[PDB]
Amino acid sequence: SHRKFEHPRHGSLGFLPRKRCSRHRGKVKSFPKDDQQKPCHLTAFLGYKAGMTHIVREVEKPGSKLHKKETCEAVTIIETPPLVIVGLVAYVKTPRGLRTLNSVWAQHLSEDVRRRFYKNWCKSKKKAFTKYALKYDSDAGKKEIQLQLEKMKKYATIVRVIAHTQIRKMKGLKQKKAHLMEIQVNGGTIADKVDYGYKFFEKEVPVEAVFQKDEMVDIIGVTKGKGYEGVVTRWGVTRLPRKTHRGLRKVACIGAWHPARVSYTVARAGQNGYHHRTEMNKKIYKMGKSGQESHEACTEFDRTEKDITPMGGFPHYGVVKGDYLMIKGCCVGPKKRVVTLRQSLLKQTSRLALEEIKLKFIDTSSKFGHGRFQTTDEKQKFYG
């Protein structure tokens, strides 16, 4: 018989299976559509989640009750020091889909990125790319490099840069192995893309070359793991009555007599968390550039000299010394987790997209307690 009352189903079938992600670094599953009229540029970046704080700003939005009034907003800090370009990858079209044409690597690769090619770096002879580097010394070897680049200009339809992070700049990460990813170039002609990506070899590309203030971006990462979980927390089903024999944290009926099988749509217990997620439309509130006034947490209204890092450091992270992004709201994953930042796939012709953010105050109180001072200088002057 039909169910007595209607309620919508718990959870989405569009994120199935709720398993552990097969990767740790978030993966771009689709780059923005290439517009060959625009200049050559990168479409993605890698960063690390430092922590959260809250800001105060005055809202300019006609028709809203918040118009000309200040609002408090939680922001996530993502430390994004510049990436190093170490290679180029070309793709050609094919009736089966895109296919890697060839790749060209730079002569100098740091040991941080070379650790990525080893399970046990310190037990090995560290021979990776040692003979490849010899093409840049002879003259027949340089001929191959130029021939590979010319093949890229003639046959490729997609050109991507091979870039890695400078993971040793963040000492609190306690990691020497860099993160490596492919980033698409989305401007100009194929010859323009190849020339643009080749001039960047062994060079640092800052976050300001990819994103700007007040832009909506997509954040890709793996959420926080939680291990084996029951249906009440994993799927959000309701608890049974207190009187329930053999426990109350289950789904009561897991299916009818027919079909004589359990369906894939019924909530079951299993892994919760550590899933790949692509979250879009996160606004950039600030770009903190190392060696500039924009790096400090002082605003035009607050002239107090303070750093972005809260008192006592970012809990479980450390001190932010490199370039960073302030982003409205929450972000996937725990602290220290590597996050992939991608340009929006759609046109951002909206008021929230086109709004101009002006910060009034940045909180730098300690997040390890009920912090009440904005700086260590203020705390010491208070106690004498």
Partner RNA sequence: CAAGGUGAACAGCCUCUGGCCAAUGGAACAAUGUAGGCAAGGGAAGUCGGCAAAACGGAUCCGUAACUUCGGGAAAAGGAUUGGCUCUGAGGACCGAC
Partner RNA sequence: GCUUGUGGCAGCCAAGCGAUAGCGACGUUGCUUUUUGAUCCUUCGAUGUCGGCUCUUCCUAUCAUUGUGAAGCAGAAUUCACCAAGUGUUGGAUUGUUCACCCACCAAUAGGGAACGUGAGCUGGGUUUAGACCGUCGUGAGACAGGUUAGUUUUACCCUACUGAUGACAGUGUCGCGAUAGUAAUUCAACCUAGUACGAGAGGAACCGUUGAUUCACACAAUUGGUCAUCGCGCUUGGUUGAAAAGCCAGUGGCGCGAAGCUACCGUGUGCCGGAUUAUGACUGAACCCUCUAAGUCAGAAUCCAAGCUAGCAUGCGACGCCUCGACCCACGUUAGGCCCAAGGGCCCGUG
Partner RNA sequence: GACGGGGCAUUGUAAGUGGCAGAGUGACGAUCCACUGAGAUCCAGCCCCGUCGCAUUCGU
Q: Binding site residues for Mg(2+), as ranges?
A: 29, 367
- Which position among 165, 272, 309, 365 is part of the footprint of another protein (CB under 8 A)? 365
**Which listed range, 61-69, 185-193, 195-203, 293-301, lies at the site for RNA (CB under 7 A)?**
61-69
**Which listed range, 151-159, 188-196, 296-304, 329-337, lies at the site for another protein (CB under 8 A)?**
296-304
Give strand pairing partners of 325.
78, 287
Angle formed at CA 160 by CA 279 and CA 95, multiple of 5 degrees: 90
Least distance (Å) from another protein to the CB of residue 69? 7
With binding defined as CB under 7 A, does residue 141 bind RNA?
A: no
**Which listed range, 190-198, 222-230, 285-293, 294-302, lies at the site for RNA (CB under 7 A)?**
222-230
Nearest Cα to 328, choosing from 352, 301, 302?
A: 352
Give strand pairing partners of 71.
57
Asked whether the beta carbons of 148 and 104 are under 8 A apart, the reply is: yes
Asked whether the beta carbons of 193 and 319 are under 8 A apart, the reply is: no
CA 190 – CA 111 distance, rounded (Å): 31
| Contacts with 254 (C-beta within 8 Å, 6 or more apart), sequence order | 262, 266, 268
What is the helix (H) or strand (E) element at residue 152, kind and residue range? helix 140-155
> Residues 21-60: x/- map of binding to another protein (CB under 8 A)?
---------------------------------xxx----
**Token digits of residue 203:** 């060079």
Nearest Cα to 85, choosing from 138, 46, 139?
A: 46
C-alpha distances in angstroms, 271 versus 261, 279, 309, 365?
A: 22, 21, 34, 36
Segment 184 to 213, residues that bind RNA, using CB under 7 A: none
Residue 154, contacted partner among RNA, another protein, K ion, none, CB below 5-8 A by kind: none
CA 340 – CA 327 distance, rounded (Å): 13
Comparison of 203 and 372: residue with beta carbon closer to RNA: 372
With binding defined as CB under 5 A, does residue 119 bind Mg ion?
A: no
Segment 97 to 126, residues that bind another protein, using CB under 8 A: none
Kindly determine how many residues on this chain lie close enough to bind Mg ion according to the rule CB under 5 A: 5
With binding defined as CB under 7 A, does residue 252 bind RNA?
A: yes
Segment 236 to 255, residues that bind Mg ion, using CB under 5 A: 245
CA 358 – CA 115 distance, rounded (Å): 42
CA 267 – CA 262 distance, rounded (Å): 10
Q: What is the CA radius of gyration of the chain?
A: 25
CA 53 – CA 202 distance, rounded (Å): 35
With binding defined as CB under 7 A, does residue 15 bind RNA?
A: yes
Binding-site residues? 29, 367
CA 300 – CA 360 distance, rounded (Å): 7
Longest dimension (CA), the chain: 83
- Which position among 6, 139, 293, 356 is part of the footprint of RNA (CB under 7 A)? 6
Least distance (Å) from Mg ion to the CB of residue 31? 9
Segment 212 to 241, residues that bind K ion, using CB under 5 A: 238-239
- Which position among 4, 29, 131, 174 is part of the footprint of Mg ion (CB under 5 A)? 29
Nearest Cα to 332, choosing from 25, 11, 116?
A: 25
Comparison of 32 and 371: residue with beta carbon closer to another protein: 371
Segment 77 to 116, residues that bind RNA, using CB under 7 A: 89, 91, 96-103, 105, 116
Residue 13, contacted partner among another protein, RNA, K ion, none, CB below 5-8 A by kind: RNA
Q: Which residue number places its CB atom closest to Mg ion?
A: 29
Least distance (Å) from another protein to the CB of residue 284? 20
Kindly determine how many residues on this chain lie close enough to bind another protein according to the rule CB under 8 A: 24
Asked whether the beta carbons of 336 and 78 are under 8 A apart, the reply is: no
With binding defined as CB under 7 A, does residue 245 bind RNA?
A: yes
Residues that bind another protein (CB under 8 A): 5-7, 54-56, 65-66, 69-72, 238, 299, 301-302, 304, 360-361, 363, 365, 370, 372, 374
Residues that bind Mg ion (CB under 5 A): 2, 29-30, 245, 367
